[PDB]
Amino acid sequence: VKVHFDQAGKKVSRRNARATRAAKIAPRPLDLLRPVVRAPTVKYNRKVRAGRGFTLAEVKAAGLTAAYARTIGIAVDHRRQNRNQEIFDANVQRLKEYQSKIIVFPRN
Amino acid sequence: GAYKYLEELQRKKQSDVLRFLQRVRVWEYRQKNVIHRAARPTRPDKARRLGYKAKQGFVIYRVRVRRGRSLRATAEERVGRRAANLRVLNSYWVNQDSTYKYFEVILVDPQHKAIRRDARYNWICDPVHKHREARGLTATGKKSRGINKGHKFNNTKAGRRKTWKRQNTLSLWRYRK
Amino acid sequence: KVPPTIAQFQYTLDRNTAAETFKLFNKYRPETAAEKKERLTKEAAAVAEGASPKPYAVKYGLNHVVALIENKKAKLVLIANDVDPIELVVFLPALCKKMGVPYAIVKGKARLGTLVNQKTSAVAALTEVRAEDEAALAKLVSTIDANFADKYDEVKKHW
Amino acid sequence: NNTKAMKHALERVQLPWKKHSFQEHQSVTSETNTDEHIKDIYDDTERELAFYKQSLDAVLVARDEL
Amino acid sequence: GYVVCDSDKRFLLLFSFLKRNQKKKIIVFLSSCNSVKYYAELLNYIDLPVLELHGKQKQQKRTNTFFEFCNAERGILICTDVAARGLDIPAVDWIIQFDPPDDPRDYIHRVGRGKSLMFLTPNPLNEYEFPENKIANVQSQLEKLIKSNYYLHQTAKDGYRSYLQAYASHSLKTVYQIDKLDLAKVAKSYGFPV
Amino acid sequence: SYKKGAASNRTKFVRSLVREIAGLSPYERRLIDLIRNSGEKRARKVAKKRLGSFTRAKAKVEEMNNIIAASRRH
Amino acid sequence: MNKQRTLLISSRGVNYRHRHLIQDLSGLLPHSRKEPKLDTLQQLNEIAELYNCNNVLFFEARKHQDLYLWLSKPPNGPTIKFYIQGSRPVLSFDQRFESSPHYQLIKELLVHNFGVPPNARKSKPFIDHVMSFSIVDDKIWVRTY
RNA sequence: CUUAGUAACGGCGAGUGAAGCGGCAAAAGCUCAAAUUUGAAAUCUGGUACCUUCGGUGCCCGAGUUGUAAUUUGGAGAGGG
RNA sequence: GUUCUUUGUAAAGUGCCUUCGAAGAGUCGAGUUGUUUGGGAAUGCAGCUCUAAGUGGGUGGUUCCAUCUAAAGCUAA
């Protein structure tokens, strides 16, 4: 019989983990820019949720390349497909807004 | 190059050419020991597509096993005990008899400096890969553990003891559900 | 009992033709590790202070030869009979007969190794040649096709 | 689902069993047993008994012809 | 009207008829616009001052340079069947068509405005003779040359890949892929037919 | 399956080359004789029993028909 | 005159309850032909061409809980789909089978398919059991005693 | 966490007991084998001599063409322009 | 931050145009004897017999359509 006594302990663990990741990845926002996706099954199709990664198509239409996308902190998925038109539009707008916000520091 | 021709030649196993090679080699391998070292892999196309480079540090042990637990894993386990410094990478079928089966298990020396260098194979040097065959982490071991993806492998995907312990032990929170 | 595609070997090239084959082939040695290294240091000493055409040599990798036959670029192909896995080279006389590239089964694998700066070679081929040895090469092609191919037309049969 | 092609199937598929003996047919057409009169269709009580009688009484039709 | 020749020396005969005839405005007709890249690139590199017209170039680049031939007196252009259609110069005497044309029916109709011969192994006017030992021995020069530059090797290749496609994409029951490929490669001079 | 598995002139060449050089397996050696004597009907029966499914045995007997016809004539 | 053959065939995926039904009925039918495996529909006619079988029973398997049995004839058989939740047999029947062509045609099939020809290959002289066929709530119920 | 004690199985009984979806925690992808470097085995081990020594370099030796390097892994990719 | 050196017709990336373009077999599968499960479409595995294909093959949905690419390997939280 397991008991989760460490609910308070592991929240403090997880928070300090994020604090270290903040200290090491200083200007960057801890997590990658994830897409916006329509959920499967009749029950949940009304819900629109955070997907895994974009696509080569959504990345190419935004105005950047796949390998470069990952270095600027955009999660890229390759097995996901662009069947829906409205989702495609929403993600492209999401990337273009993100590209206006980003400030990529020089390597010198 | 030739590996396409060999790949297709190894398909027709009971055909006249390969049938004759079997009956000669089956006699020859019985003359030698139970567990012994072959200098070169007899089916080199298969050796390659299971991760063998013909450089210093790679060893091809030939192993004999009885007929009628799995025989491929027993073959790997036998060479593991004899050649303890080596690490089992993969094994493959070469020849069989009515009484015995033969496998040409391929090994890597983690201690040899030609493997400690190059990054394509230096992963095997990591102590997490000591006796891969004794834990079923080889190709045939992972096969017998029923570890794939699908509806078929639901009760035995991420450890059959792990999913049992998860399902048959009570879980309670601080503020009870 | 041997199945006809095995023992298409052992019915090898005879004494005099094999000698004449090496009289040609020993002219076309690959430049050895020592010779190649010293040449490049000569190039380093010269070009750093103050043109050459493509040099012909024999081609000797199994993958390289199986490329060259069916490319088609090979003219003569020598094949050793003694090979540890025989199945490595059993298709090769048939490949040459199918693509119409003249081949010869030579006797001794180390005998191929001598002309090529290796221990053993299993297969050796001469893709291209210098102009002086062109007529001699084509004569040897006819010599090999008369001795090897025409005498042993029945080599595809008989166990 | 039309019955024109169904009747065309009765033309080609169906074999004449009346021309041959009951030996070759071996099929008791237990007629006048509608079985919509069976009480308790969801409890499976009279459904067991009425079918068991339908099967066993059919043997006696074939028994004389055997 | 025609000259009977085998596929080996079809190009080799043509180079003879050009060198012997170096004063007259003469036109060759070849099939592929890809191909007359090739036969133009040889002749400027085996040094005959030829001209070149094909679809793979611009319009006024094609036109203004075609304009140079029309006001000329001596030389020679190489063009396609298609790009020269509708634009015959009356100042010409030899129309040699190397290939079976695009439309074989309507081809005779475009003559009558210009002396004609063609080239065919199995396939009004008369033929000509040819003394067979007169063809230029440049095939020794060419085989070295087809191996040395890679640009000339590439353009030999496209001049071969596109030659036979057009040979298959044709009308007639006669001109359909019977011809052996050992010799059409020799018209572009290979050891092996690519 | 956009990359389904196109013909590939080389692969076709290698498969048919090995098909003759290897010879014939004992069941196939029996099978080709069974075609010439007992017909294609009984050949498909033995091939279905020997192999797994009938869908395999169709393409197998069809391959044997191609081998026999091309051997004797050409 | 009655010379027929039965051909029990199955699709990929059959065990416990359904394989109890397949194996025991294959045992109970002396003229049965037990086959390995199938995967799809047009092929089934050519399966009958092999063994000269006058009958066919095809077990199709779809949505993980259900059952879909296909009964048909060799030359030009009109098939009927089903959804159910070695002595010489005696074949009992129903009045409501003869009420419509819908149940009369399937009655004909159940006579010579699920029954027996007298000249079967594994035919035993001694009798043991009966075959109960009857309709209640638009469906059939069969038990062997 | 929930789906859920649901589907499903169990002389339907002692009872056994999931999974996809959804919310979250954490997020990272890639390497081979595959068609030739063929205008040059471009690779590595070891010994030895020095050097700025978890190593570098020269020289010698061996492995290695029965294929070690570079280039490619379907998200394609390569050849050229 | 502070410098010392950066080289070689070197190493890539991007878009367009042109020519090609190979992906794992005693394995998949098939029958059967056991083991595994609460597993109904013997699930998973092993033993034994036979053993494939390349506009292929595996898995699902009512006559097509959707979905991935096995039989090789590495990897933190």
8 Å CB contact between G4 and G55? yes
Nearest 10 degrees: CA dihedral of F14, F16, F20, F22? 50
**Strands (DSSP E) along chain G, which ranges?**
8-10, 56-60, 68-72, 80-82, 88-92, 127-132, 135-136, 139-140
Measured CA angle at C14 (ends C13, C16), to 5 deg: 120
Strands of E47-184, DSSP E: 50-52, 76-80, 94-97, 115-117
All domains in chain F, ordered by first residue? 1-74 (1.10.10.1760)
Distance B154 CA to I39 C1' (A): 10
Distance A105 CA to I4 C1' (A): 26
B9 interfaces chain F, CB cutoff of 8 Å: yes
Reading phi first (left if > 0) and then psi (alpha if -120 to 50, else beta), residue A41 is in: left
H-run or E-run covering E156: helix E151-168
CB atoms inside a 10 Å sphere around CB A48: 14
Close Cβ partners of F57 (under 8 Å, ≥ 6 residues apart): F44, F47, F48, F50, F51
What are the phi and psi torsion angles at G132 (to 5°)?
-85, 115
Cα dist. E182→B69, E10, E136, E176, E189 in Å? 61, 13, 20, 16, 10
Contact call for residues C29 and C57 (beta carbons, < 8 A): yes
Best probe of the A interface among B171, B176, B177, by most A CBs < 10 A, is: B171
Alpha-carbon gap, residue D41 to D47, rounded angstroms: 7
**How do E50-52 and E26-30 pair as beta strands?**
unpaired
Tokens 């169709």 found at: F58
> Is there a contact between C155 and C103 (Cβ–Cβ < 8 Å)?
no
**Which residue carries 């897409």 as its tokens?**
A35
Protein-covered nucleotides of chain I (CB closer than 7 Å) are: 13-15, 18-27, 29-31, 36-37, 39-56, 59-62, 67-68, 71-77
- Which pair of structure tokens corresponds to residue A52? 């895994």
- Which residue on chain B is closest to C4 by alpha carbon? B17
Which residues from chain B sit within 8 angstroms of residue A3, using beta carbons? 172-174
The Cα of G143 is separated from the nearest Cα of chain F by a number of Å equal to 33
Cα dihedral E37, E38, E39, E44, rounded to 10, equals 80
How far apart CA E118 and CA E111 sit, in angstroms, is: 13
Judge contact between G130 and D56, C-beta under 8 A.
yes
Q: Are the beta carbons of B60 and B38 closer than 8 angstroms?
A: yes
Q: How was this structure determined?
A: cryo-EM
Residue E51 backbone dihedrals phi, psi, to 5 degrees: -120, 160
B57: nearest nucleotide, CA–C1' criterion? H45
Chain E neighbors of C100, CB-CB under 8 A: none
Count: domains in chain B: 1
E18: tokens are: 């050009």
Helix (H, G, I), strand (E, B) or coil at C25: helix
Max CA pair span of chain D? 43
Letter string b/e over residues G75-86, b meaning 16 or more CB atoms within 10 A of that residue's CB: eebbeeeeeeeb
C6, C69, C71, C87: which to substitute to probe chain B, counting the most B Cβ within 10 Å? C87
Which residues share a beta bridge with G56?
Answer: G72
Chain C meets chain B (3+ C-beta pairs below 8 A): yes
User: DSSP H helical segments within chain B, as ranges?
Assistant: 3-9, 16-31, 44-48, 71-82, 113-117, 139-144, 160-167
Chain G contact for F52, CB < 8 A?
Answer: yes
B108 φ, ψ (degrees, to nearest 5):
-130, 135
- DSSP 3-state of D17: coil
CA distance B59 to B53: 10
Residue F53 CB lies within 7 Å of the nucleic strand I: yes
Report yes or no: F45 at the G interface, CB cutoff 8 Å: yes
Residue B34 CA to residue B65 CA, distance in Å, equals: 8
> Any chain F CB within 8 A of the CB of G38?
yes
Query: Which residue's structure tokens are 């090491």?
Result: A24
Which among B4, B5, B7 is the top mutation candidate for probing chain C, defined by the most C β-carbons within 10 Å of its own β-carbon?
Answer: B5
Q: Within 82-141 of chain G, which residues have Cβ less than 7 Å from strand I?
A: none
Q: Is the dihedral of CA E91, E96, E98, E102 positive or negative?
A: positive
Q: How far is the CA of B52 from the C1' of H58 (A)?
A: 33
What CATH number is associated with residue C27?
Answer: 3.30.1330.30
What's the rounded Cα separation, in Å, for the pair F54 and B30?
A: 39
- Full domain range(s) for residue B7: 1-177
**Which B residues 141-170 touch A at CB under 8 Å?**
169-170
Q: Are D13 and G77 in contact (CB under 8 A)?
A: yes
Contact present, B57 and B87 (Cβ < 8 Å): no
Q: Domain range holding C85?
A: 1-159
Are E25 and E69 within 8 A, CB to CB?
yes
| Strand I contact with B87 (CB < 7 A) | no
Q: What are the respective helix, strand and coil percentages of chain G, to the nearest 5?
A: 25, 25, 55
Spatial distance between the Cα atoms of E54 and A108, rounded to a whole number of angstroms: 51
Burial tier of E77 (Cβ tally within 10 Å: 0-12, 13-18, 19+): buried
- Which positions in strand H are less than 7 Å from the protein's CB atoms? 1-2, 7-10, 17-36, 38-42, 44-46, 59-61, 63-69, 74-76, 80
Q: Helices E10-20 and E35-45: crossing angle, nearest 10°?
A: 50
CATH number at residue B17: 3.40.1120.10
Tell me how many degrees the CA angle D23-D25-D28 measures, rounded to the nearest 5.
100
DSSP B141-152: HHHHTT-SSSST
The Cα–Cα gap between B19 and C159 comes to: 14
In Å, what is the separation between the CA of D60 and the C1' of H52? 112
Q: Does D10 touch chain G (CB under 8 A)?
A: yes
- How far does the CA of A63 sit from the C1' of I59, in Å? 37
Say yes or no: Cβ of F4 under 7 A from any atom of strand I. Answer: yes
- Angstrom distance (rounded) from CA C107 to CA A27: 72
Q: Which nucleotide is nearest to B90 (CA to C1')?
A: I72
Q: Which residues of chain G (34-53) touch nucleic strand I at CB < 7 A?
A: 36-37
* Nearest amino-acid residue to I44, taking CA and C1': B146
Name the 3-class secondary structure at D46. Answer: helix
**Cα–Cα distance between C21 and C19 in angstroms, integer?**
5
Task: Please check whether strand I approaches the CB of F5 to within 7 Å.
Answer: yes
Handedness of CA F21, F27, F33, F36 (dihedral sign): negative
What angle do the packed helices G101-112 and D4-12 form, to 10 degrees?
30
| The dihedral sign for the CA sequence C67, C68, C72, C76 | negative
Exposure class string for E81-119: b at 16+ Cβ within 10 A, else e: bebbeeeebeebebbbbbbbbbeeeebeebeeeeebbbb
Number of domains in chain C: 1
Please tell me whether any atom of strand I lies within 7 Å of the Cβ of B161. no
Chain A 11..50 CB hits on strand I (< 7 A): 17
Smallest Cα–C1' distance to nucleotide H36: which residue has it?
C64
Residue nearest to nucleotide H41 (CA to C1'): C33
Name the residues in B22-81 having a C-beta closer than 7 Å to nucleic acid strand I.
Answer: 43, 45-46, 49-51, 67-72
**Which residues have CB under 8 Å from B131's CB, separation 6+?**
B80, B87, B88
Amino acid (one-letter) located at B155: N
Question: Would you list the DSSP string of A9-51?
Answer: HHHHHHHHHHHHHHHHSTTS-SS-B--EEE--STTTTT-EEE-
CA-based nearest distance B170→chain A, Å: 5
**Closest chain G residue to F45 measured between Cα atoms?**
G50
C63 and chain B: CB distance < 8 Å anywhere?
Answer: yes
C-alpha span between G115 and G131 (Å, rounded): 8
Q: Resolution limit in angstroms?
A: 3.2
Q: Judging by beta carbons within 10 Å of its beta carbon (0-12, 13-18, 19+), is residue E157 exposed, middle or buried? A: middle
The whole-angstrom distance between F46's CA and the closest CA on chain G is 10
Shortest CA to C1' contact from A78: nucleotide: H75
Q: D30 vs A100, D26, E137, G7, CA distance in Å? A: 84, 13, 101, 26
DSSP C148: I
G17 CB less than 7 Å from any atom of strand I: yes
Q: What is the CA radius of gyration of chain C?
A: 17
Q: Which chains pack against G, by 3+ Cβ pairs within 8 A?
A: D, F
